[PDB]
Amino acid sequence: LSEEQKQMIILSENFQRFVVRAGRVIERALSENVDIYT
Amino acid sequence: QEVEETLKRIQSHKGVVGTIVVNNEGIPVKSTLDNTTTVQYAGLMSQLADKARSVVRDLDPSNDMTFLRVRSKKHEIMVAPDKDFILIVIQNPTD
């Protein structure tokens, strides 16, 4: 909710490593939907 | 960092329009959209992700949804939900 808090999370190891998971999962979908070689 | 350098690596994928992060509660954390809008998506998508995850759970309790994506005429929304956070990305397909 609050401001300073969003910050605390953004710099956690909960989030730092979740963002990298989802990240990888997605980055496939992303390039199926789109021809990156064109 | 990898977080800021990844969250941005997505935002610039060919065809990406927006990107948002939420939590179990449906509260936007970081998000590349005007905030009044970023509210919409979080609320709805979180609901959608719940139902879906729940549907997946009722078809089978030993299963958990990993990834969901709804395609419209205009674009595709995806949503990777991961316990406490969920990443929404709107993309513009080609198709």
Curated annotation (Swiss-Prot), chain A:
Q: In which tissues is it expressed?
A: High levels of isoform 1b, isoform 1c, isoform 3a and isoform 4 accumulate in early egg chambers and at stage 9 become concentrated at the posterior of the oocyte. Isoform 5a and isoform 5b are highly expressed in adult head and to a lesser extent in adult torso. Isoform 1a, isoform 2a and isoform 2b are found in all tissues examined, including ovaries, midgut, torso and head.
Organism name: Drosophila melanogaster (Fruit fly)
Functional summary from the UniProt entry? Acts as one of several non-catalytic accessory components of the cytoplasmic dynein 1 complex that are thought to be involved in linking dynein to cargos and to adapter proteins that regulate dynein function. Cytoplasmic dynein 1 acts as a motor for the intracellular retrograde motility of vesicles and organelles along microtubules. The intermediate chains mediate the help dynein bind to dynactin 150 kDa component.
Taxonomy, superkingdom: Eukaryota
Q: Which part of the full protein is shown?
A: 242 to 279 of 663
Task: Name it.
Answer: Cytoplasmic dynein 1 intermediate chain
Which gene name does the record give?
sw
Similarity comment: family membership: Belongs to the dynein intermediate chain family.
Q: Where in the cell is it found?
A: Cytoplasm, Cytoskeleton
Subunit info here reads: Homodimer. The cytoplasmic dynein 1 complex consists of two catalytic heavy chains (HCs) and a number of non-catalytic subunits presented by intermediate chains (ICs), light intermediate chains (LICs) and light chains (LCs).
